[PDB]
Amino acid sequence: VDFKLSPSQLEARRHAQAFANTVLTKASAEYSTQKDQLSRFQATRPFYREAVRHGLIKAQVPIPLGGTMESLVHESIILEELFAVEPATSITIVATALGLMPVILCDSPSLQEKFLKPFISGEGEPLASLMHSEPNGTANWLQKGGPGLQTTARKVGNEWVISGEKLWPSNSGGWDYKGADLACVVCRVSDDPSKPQDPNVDPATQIAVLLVTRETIANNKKDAYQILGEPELAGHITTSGPHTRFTEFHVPHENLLCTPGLKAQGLVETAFAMSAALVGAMAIGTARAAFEEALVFAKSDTRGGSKHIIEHQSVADKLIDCKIRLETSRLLVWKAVTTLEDEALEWKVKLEMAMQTKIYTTDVAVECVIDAMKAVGMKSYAKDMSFPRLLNEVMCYPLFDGGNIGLRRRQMQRVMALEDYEPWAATYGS
Amino acid sequence: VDFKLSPSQLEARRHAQAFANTVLTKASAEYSTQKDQLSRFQATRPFYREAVRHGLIKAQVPIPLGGTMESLVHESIILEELFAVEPATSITIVATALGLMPVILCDSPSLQEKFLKPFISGEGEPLASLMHSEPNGTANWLQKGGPGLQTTARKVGNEWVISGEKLWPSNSGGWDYKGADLACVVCRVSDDPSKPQDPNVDPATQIAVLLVTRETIANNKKDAYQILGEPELAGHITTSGPHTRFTEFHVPHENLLCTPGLKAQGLVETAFAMSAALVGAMAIGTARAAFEEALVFAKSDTRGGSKHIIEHQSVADKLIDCKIRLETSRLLVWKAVTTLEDEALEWKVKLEMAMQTKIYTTDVAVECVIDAMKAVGMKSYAKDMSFPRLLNEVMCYPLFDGGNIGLRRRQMQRVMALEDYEPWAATYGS
Amino acid sequence: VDFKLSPSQLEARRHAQAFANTVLTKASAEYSTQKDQLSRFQATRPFYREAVRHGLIKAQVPIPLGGTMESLVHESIILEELFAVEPATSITIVATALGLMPVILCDSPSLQEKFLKPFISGEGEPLASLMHSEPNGTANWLQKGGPGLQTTARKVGNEWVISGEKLWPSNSGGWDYKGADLACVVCRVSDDPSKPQDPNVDPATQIAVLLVTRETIANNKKDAYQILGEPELAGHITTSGPHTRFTEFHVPHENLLCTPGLKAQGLVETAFAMSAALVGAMAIGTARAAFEEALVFAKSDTRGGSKHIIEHQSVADKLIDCKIRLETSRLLVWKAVTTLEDEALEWKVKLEMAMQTKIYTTDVAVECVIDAMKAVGMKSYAKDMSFPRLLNEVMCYPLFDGGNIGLRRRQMQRVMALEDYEPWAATYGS
Amino acid sequence: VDFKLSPSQLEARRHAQAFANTVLTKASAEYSTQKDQLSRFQATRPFYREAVRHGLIKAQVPIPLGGTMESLVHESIILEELFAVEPATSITIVATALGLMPVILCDSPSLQEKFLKPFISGEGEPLASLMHSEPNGTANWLQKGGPGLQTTARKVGNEWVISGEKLWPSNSGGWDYKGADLACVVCRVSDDPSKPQDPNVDPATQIAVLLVTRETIANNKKDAYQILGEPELAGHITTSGPHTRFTEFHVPHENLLCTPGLKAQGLVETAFAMSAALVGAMAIGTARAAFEEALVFAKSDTRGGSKHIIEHQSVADKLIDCKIRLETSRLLVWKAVTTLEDEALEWKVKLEMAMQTKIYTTDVAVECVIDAMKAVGMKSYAKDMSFPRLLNEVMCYPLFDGGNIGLRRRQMQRVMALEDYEPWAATYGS
């Protein structure tokens, strides 16, 4: 085994560092002057445009599909660098990547070519979004005997009609709330939403994914697609994840990601599994920023003492703990993404590895930021340092992209409970 | 041994609750429309004025001195209730109480009856502040051979001349930056601030506390007392702890709190030890609000499932951990405050108990808020819930009023290292 | 609010200390030469006798019933001192107290008078045991639809026939496997053992507690009561809790503790709820012994350095954390035992407090011992120090007397799930 | 970046598993009957003999030196499989590897060829030991101005005379207390052991390593080399780490490992850094055995419930936490040993990675065994399950091979304090 980065991986890092260093660094000056979530988001459009220009959006699509993605390892390296500087715009990129994953994973060349085109063109500010989350929650969306998703779809002729509400999906409403360039709406098939989901059926067999573009939205009545609100977040204040309501929203049958059922649910699961693995790079990035800033401070400040505070064991212990969390996190992420790319491995093995990664990396990231603040002391509580922003943003990772308590841990539990569970299949094989 | 509350204490809670729900609840609507810390602080004045009218300020001065204080247990019960609703103004009350303690503890009836007059009248909005913290830090202010406090004082004629800068002292500048009604400036005696502190002289033996009032500031040149800035805090955004600079600031000798040296340092230590214990009440209040909001949510929301999330063991485990943290914390606080009033115990014993409380309560309060958020899930990240504000505010406790890593733990370590260390003196007597 | 110990409580500690230092300290030299669990337990008999003579068994019975129990706080204080020195015999005293509680709590004066007699006489060495635990576990014994207790009682004429196996009940077989002087066998009423429990009837309504004595066993066939094995434990190597098999074991109807059903289940719950609060005293005692031995070592050993290791911040941090855990634990236990004795509080509130105590104290105790060993270093791993023993014994508390994960946390979760759940009822009343 | 294993690495795992299953599993039945440490240690000799015959000893010496070690990753895999079954003998192999390390790392083919010969012959049961640890401790053996090592050496004619005592060195005395086939005694140069170390000279410059064989001991007076005792350990009851007291022990000048000073200290530091990295493999092996035993139990036992306990979220949470700690640990170890073999990275980087590994893996392994026990419940406390043994064995890891609190963390803190500290050098290059 080896951990020596290839020339292209080293370049991806270099390129990624130069980007946010010369681009993202100027982001705050713009959105910091906005009064609301949406305004802040829109203020980042120019920076997203640059991301596109630098080919960071095209890098989210596989080469075989006209993109420039090299591997999940390159992507993890790039994300770490971006989040280590500015999550703004960087989060918009990962959001788009998620929105594209279902199409990238489906087995319909014509569908991919048609919907991925604006993302591989390298121009404009194409936004993608995987609309799954709902106001009532989704941790139990696959619970047999449960209500199931409240966003339902029914086939009426050569088209589908969507009804329901979504909440949290990133960039779902695009820059101007008239829809994202591409949205994968996850729905539960139901000819009559008024009637509860059959408690005897497997919820996964009721899943359908409908591709919704700005064109789709413009072909519908205005009251068929509307944004009820834009949540004000504690951190990631420039991100958009509106509360959207679909009322008799018509979608062409040609926009069906795939045959409703297990195949559709499998695509959503695969997309979220790959995302869970990459979320680690985001947590590491944010946590690393705190660590390096505390490290720099501890090695150059005595706090009125006779020596740099890093000389005090208690301070060093905190920093040591931070370093270890980051190091173990990155290794787990790399192992996860590489495991996901190993065709010879069973999906259950890949899913477990991805779940572990998301759970661990997001939990310790919070601890790392807090410990860094304790080591720095009172000064870390003022806005003149990065810590205030970092705490609010790191607290999002353990909650988003499938909270650890309600979703990820449960998905992992399920796999571990299987009779043929192979604990170390991803390491020593079978 | 018993824990039953007396009618006096039960009344304190009710009054604290009534005040917090009638006055404090309306604070947000006022300071939320302000742009900066200072403006947000000034916006809380009408609320501080109401606190004074409710005798909350006079309740910070012991009856013998003209106040109406009943006990530290009453004060803790009050603080828990106030902070469980709105830290704004509440933090101002505790700040004034701290700046008052030095005078309350000194054995000079003359200074007391003179400088405690405006705080017991029950009129206006008198602010007191203990100016100790400095821009370079204070965790090593007593280290032998170190730089020592940067705020020095020298005797010139029949008055003292202060030179140096202070940073973080609450309400130190007052409502209009013209100085707090009463300020206890902690300085290091030095005839020449140009030369470093004598490395062969014990720092504590050179500590002096000068009382500075608005009048004192008015009797000096405008450039002798200047506010250099107001730090933007991540939490407790309505507090004021400016960066003050003293330049040949002349103070009457009659304003010396006590003899310079160990007696002055003792007053400061004692004041900070008492506040350190009461901080636990503030931490509990903040952490309780998070626990309760999460508890209510878990017993009323199913998150799209078939049952309330509290029925999920993982969720219950989180709520249970928060409950235990809050429970153990309140008991510790109560034990600490009582121990501090037990004149049958040596100071080292009281000190150690006070440090234990501050270290434990503030540390677990952070974990309690975070665990609660993880239980609630994604929705806890939206500002429509209290969690966003609670997280920011709670992260201040482990850092302020003497950080745990640099100050409190060191103070406790010192006592434990002593030859006559009595581990359980506060419990099973000495 | 008062933590001042009365003269009787202070006297209880002194008495326990004297007993521990004069008697318990000599136990090790006796059982250490035995090659098995039973033999080691028997070797402690000549030590239990002393406990009886000192009135330790009599102190397990309330005064109104002929005992000398002063209060649970006295018991808490006594157990801490006893376990801080030697778990041997001390655990046997706790075991007897548990086996006596059902009778102590029942509403049958005649029954109490009859069966408690040999325990309040202060003669010989009477052993009591609450036989509840079984080979298949008991965490789900009250689970509706589950198999329930595998030890069942069948009413045959004027006698009860017991069938099934018990495992873990402390000293249930007495000193010679001829049975404890008094055993409270918790059974599930079943007219036909070969048939599974009825999934339509609440398990709690089928619980019966049968009193079994050495006489009852003598009145039965030899193989109607047999010890199948004596588990070799990791710690508390002198305790007895055999695997017992009841085959057509006849028990006089008069030996029925009370009316089968909710009332019987109620007695078992209250008994285990009271012990759950007291185990905290046992955990504190074992952890205190580790902390004190690490503290003494740290204050007198430099480990080849130039100063006592307690001067190193990392060592101090460990000691500080152990002290806090011990401090918060004792306060919780006292609050719990005090709450349990408050006749003005609903059972729900008392049970909740008892669960919090058992969960917190036993969990934190394990960390306290481990941290003490890390602070001491390599030396703590040799049997020339007492850590090796403290580690194995402390690890028992989280698992025994109702495991935290399967039983205690679940009982607490249930209480919190209730619609009328009052979080702070035990502190601020209703 | 790649984690895939080569055919040789998989073969190494299969070979280790076969050896542990066909040989190590029979060790317990042999040493369990012995009464003391030495006797137990001696009972493992036949098993160590088999290890030799299986070439496991020769596999501790690099291929360029005539050994058969393929790489540190192969070694890490072998150790994990061995310790997952039986630490006995396995720990002996590890001890020998550390003892040979100083010679393996020195730049003298002549010395290497001469002293490594018995260990690569593939016959007998040769033991090696790195004698560094002492009765007074060694955490501050390099502290400037401190006592320093108490085992001193002085040059007399064409040979050296050793004076002092060693405590803990594994197999230092050999199978019959006549000495290990090879021992690297770490001494502090001093012409007069009665005089204190010069507080003006860097301790590292006075370090000397002398090679002592059974022949060396046999060529000295019986009173010059004597075992003063064999500590009884809580775990790893078959390991030997005598208390030796060199008295005017004469060693040939040619047996000097290298020139006294930083070079000698460098060899010790390097040897211990590599051991620290491999210790993680041992911790993983032990923790893995606990995890797997609890996993199997949780999937096949309902504990009197209606479903396997793994179906309970609190139980799954414990197993998930264990799995994650194991996964992150193996990855950190593989990364560490790989970093150690990277000739492109400077020492400080390799050292930092090695310390992080020892610190994380050993600490986390303890938590894993405990969580596994809490998951299984009461049954884990009985010796009919392996948990009791695993708990005692895992607790040694955080303390031995350089405790984390006194040595490892201090070594890491030293590196991080360096002005040229490159946090991510091992990952993203310099």
Ligand SMILES: [C][C]([C]([C])[N+](=O)[O-])N1=C2C(=O)[N]C(=O)N=C2N([C][C]([O])[C]([O])[C]([O])[C]OP([O])(=O)OP([O])(=O)O[C][C]2O[C](N3[C]=NC4=C3N=[C]N=C4[N])[C]([O])[C]2[O])C2=[C]C([C])=C([C])[C]=C21
């Ligand atoms: C993530 C994403 C991004 C872009 N990235 O990728 O990075 N985003 C998104 C998108 O895109 N899309 C979608 O759809 N979405 C999203 N988001 C949202 C989120 O993710 C969500 O919401 C989450 O994650 C989920 O939620 P949660 O929280 O996890 O769940 P719920 O349902 O809500 O629940 C809550 C709670 O409760 C409990 N539970 C429940 N259930 C259960 C439980 N437990 C146990 N068991 C069971 N069964 C728990 O506690 C939970 O937690 C997003 C967001 C944001 C902010 C951003 C920025 C982005 C995004």
Ligand SMILES: [C][C]([C]([C])[N+](=O)[O-])N1=C2C(=O)[N]C(=O)N=C2N([C][C]([O])[C]([O])[C]([O])[C]OP([O])(=O)OP([O])(=O)O[C][C]2O[C](N3[C]=NC4=C3N=[C]N=C4[N])[C]([O])[C]2[O])C2=[C]C([C])=C([C])[C]=C21
């Ligand atoms: C608190 C108060 C209030 C009002 N109350 O009472 O509630 N305030 C105040 C006042 O009033 N006054 C004064 O003076 N001040 C104040 N503040 C401020 C604070 O408190 C301070 O600043 C703190 O606490 C302190 O600081 P810290 O951080 O703790 O310390 P420093 O110096 O800074 O340091 C840092 C760090 O470093 C380290 N270290 C050092 N040294 C050492 C160490 N370690 C170890 N060892 C040693 N020796 C550590 O890490 C530390 O941490 C305030 C504030 C606020 C915010 C408010 C609101 C209020 C107030």
Ligand SMILES: [C][C]([C]([C])[N+](=O)[O-])N1=C2C(=O)[N]C(=O)N=C2N([C][C]([O])[C]([O])[C]([O])[C]OP([O])(=O)OP([O])(=O)O[C][C]2O[C](N3[C]=NC4=C3N=[C]N=C4[N])[C]([O])[C]2[O])C2=[C]C([C])=C([C])[C]=C21
């Ligand atoms: C405790 C006692 C003493 C004397 N004191 O009090 O001190 N002892 C006894 C007596 O006396 N009696 C009786 O009866 N018993 C006894 N023991 C025994 C014990 O306690 C028992 O066994 C326990 O505690 C119970 O068990 P656990 O473990 O807790 O449960 P189980 O069933 O077995 O289970 C296990 C596990 O699994 C799981 N889970 C289940 N289920 C569930 C779960 N989770 C969740 N959820 C659900 N549902 C968990 O993980 C659990 O853990 C005793 C003992 C000993 C050792 C001694 C020394 C004494 C005694």
Ligand SMILES: [C][C]([C]([C])[N+](=O)[O-])N1=C2C(=O)[N]C(=O)N=C2N([C][C]([O])[C]([O])[C]([O])[C]OP([O])(=O)OP([O])(=O)O[C][C]2O[C](N3[C]=NC4=C3N=[C]N=C4[N])[C]([O])[C]2[O])C2=[C]C([C])=C([C])[C]=C21
């Ligand atoms: C390890 C080894 C084996 C074989 N392997 O490799 O696996 N072994 C050995 C050998 O071989 N050799 C030698 O030499 N040794 C040995 N060992 C022993 C051990 O390792 C040692 O001893 C340890 O680790 C070290 O110790 P510690 O504990 O770490 O240190 P001290 O000095 O003792 O100390 C203690 C304590 O204190 C404190 N501190 C001190 N100092 C300081 C501190 N803190 C802070 N700072 C400073 N400066 C702390 O707390 C510490 O901890 C061994 C063993 C065993 C058991 C085995 C089985 C084997 C072996």
